[PDB]
């Protein structure tokens, strides 16, 4: 990826809040990236931009590699439905056959330790079950860049345990870009760190240096 020049603003009533201005940053390669940022920064906005959810209006991004959809903690799923039809829709949306779709759905149910609640509408899930389903779906598909937005903050220890097990079963061919507020996790889940402040974005190799820049 290249992440060429861009400008990102939103139609605020008080004129226009130019969140991103003239950002020309080249992301590192073959290393997990940790976005730290702060409140009021554009980590989620940048996260969606990486996922192609909304196109830049005064810029563009070059991505010559497959990008998985963002996970997040809200959005990306359809309510009033059970997870079963949602996962059938998500494997149908990428033009798949029946055998791979069925086996990937089966993997989705196997990863998530969910009983009858898997056959329940999207309204009747807790804050953790939806995140677990989304996280299991994220590593279901084959990609290179896995986009994580603090999707474990609502999970138990076993969730982190088998998520780490799955990722270590899938290391060597894909890398992860994640943003979280628990830096004990990002210390051991990332290689290099990127800090964004006042719209500006900066990269930090050493994780401790990025932590100090966060708290600086």
């Amino acid at each position: 990826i290249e992440l060429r020049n861009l400008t990102k603003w939103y139609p605020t009533p008080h004129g226009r809040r130019y969140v991103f201005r003239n950002l020309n940053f080249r992301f590192p390669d073959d290393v997990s990236i940790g976005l730290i940022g702060r409140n009021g920064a554009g980590k989620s906005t940048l996260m969606r931009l990486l996922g192609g959810i909304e196109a830049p209006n005064e810029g563009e991004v070059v991505t010559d590699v497959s990008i998985s959809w963002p996970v997040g903690l809200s959005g990306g799923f359809q309510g009033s439905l059970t997870a079963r039809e949602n996962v059938k829709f998500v494997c149908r949306i990428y033009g798949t056959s029946h055998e791979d779709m069925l086996r990937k759905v089966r993997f989705v149910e196997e990863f998530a330790e969910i009983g009858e609640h898997f056959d329940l509408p999207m309204k009747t899930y807790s804050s953790g079950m939806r995140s677990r389903v989304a996280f299991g779906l994220s590593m279901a598909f084959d990609f290179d860049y896995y986009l994580i937005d603090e999707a474990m903050a609502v999970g138990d220890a076993q969730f982190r345990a088998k998520s780490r097990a799955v990722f270590d079963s899938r290391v060597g061919q894909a890398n992860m870009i994640l943003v979280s507020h628990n830096m004990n996790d990002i210390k051991e889940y990332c290689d290099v760190v990127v800090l964004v402040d006042q719209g500006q974005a900066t990269l930090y190799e050493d994780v401790e240096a990025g932590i100090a820049a966060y708290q600086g």
Binding site: I53, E54, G76, Q78, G79, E85, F89, I93, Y94, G95
Partner: protein, 257 residues
């Protein structure tokens, strides 16, 4: 890398069945509703205007006079009133890099086109079964008029959906905009009884022209009123489609969140 047409077909198919289970409903009440409401309306108008229609013109019978103008009108009404939530109710799904608002507005249109074609076929079959005329005399003209009606209605629905994204109140407007259209179009009663002095204001409704042309091309002896043509609705459909596509392409990136 597969062609964008193949991924369009996959996206449209996936959105199709997706929309099917909710438009029809898991209670299976959707099918009973959409084949019990039309016959209920048919029974209503007939019970209240059989004598009036027989006085106006006795060449053709009311149960077959009204169905041919009602079902296309219901089709256009639905494809102009359900495309409002084709994006707003489907907003939460816009997170997979391939789904676009045009896909979600035309998938619902395809679904309801299929539904109304099925209801038209079964209604024609049951009307022939009951002992009434059920063969269009000039079916090609009816097909062309239905196609131009679909063009106009889908264009208007897309334009309204593009405009309404800022203010979701517009539903109410189309709802009140839906009241005179059921009455001023002459679907319930023939336009013979309309006084000539009022006639220009009736002639400004394209759906009236389309219903009149459908009735003329269906029955073997229906006569059109002077001033009713096909140039006006065709030009309206073309210009409206151009302006709707024009708007959608102007505000494509804002169609998110």
């Amino acid at each position: 890398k597969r062609s964008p047409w193949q991924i369009q077909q996959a996206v449209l198919f996936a959105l199709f069945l997706r929309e099917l289970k909710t438009r029809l409903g898991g209670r299976w009440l959707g099918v009973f509703w959409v084949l019990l409401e039309p016959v209920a309306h048919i029974a209503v108008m007939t019970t209240l205007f059989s004598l009036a229609h027989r006085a106006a013109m006795p060449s053709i019978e009311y149960p077959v006079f009204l169905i041919t103008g009602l079902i296309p009108f219901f089709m256009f009404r639905g494809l102009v009133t359900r495309l409002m939530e084709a994006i707003d109710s489907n907003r939460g799904l816009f997170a997979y890099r391939q789904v676009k608002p045009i896909d979600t507005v035309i998938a619902r249109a395809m679904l309801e086109i299929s539904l109304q074609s099925i209801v038209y076929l079964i209604a024609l079959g049951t009307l022939g079964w009951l002992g009434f005329h059920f063969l269009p005399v000039r079916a090609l003209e009816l097909a062309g008029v239905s196609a131009v009606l679909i063009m106009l209605g889908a264009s208007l629905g897309l334009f309204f959906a593009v405009v309404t994204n800022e203010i979701p109140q517009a539903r109410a407007i189309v709802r009140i905009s839906l009241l005179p259209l059921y009455f001023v179009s002459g679907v319930i009663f023939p336009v013979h009884t309309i006084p000539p002095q009022y006639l220009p204001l009736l002639q400004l409704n394209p759906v009236l022209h389309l219903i009149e042309l459908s009735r003329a091309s269906f029955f073997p002896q229906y006569r059109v009123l002077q001033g009713i043509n096909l140039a006006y609705p065709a030009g309206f459909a073309l210009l409206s489609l151009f302006l709707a596509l024009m708007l959608y392409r102007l505000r494509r990136h804002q169609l998110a969140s």
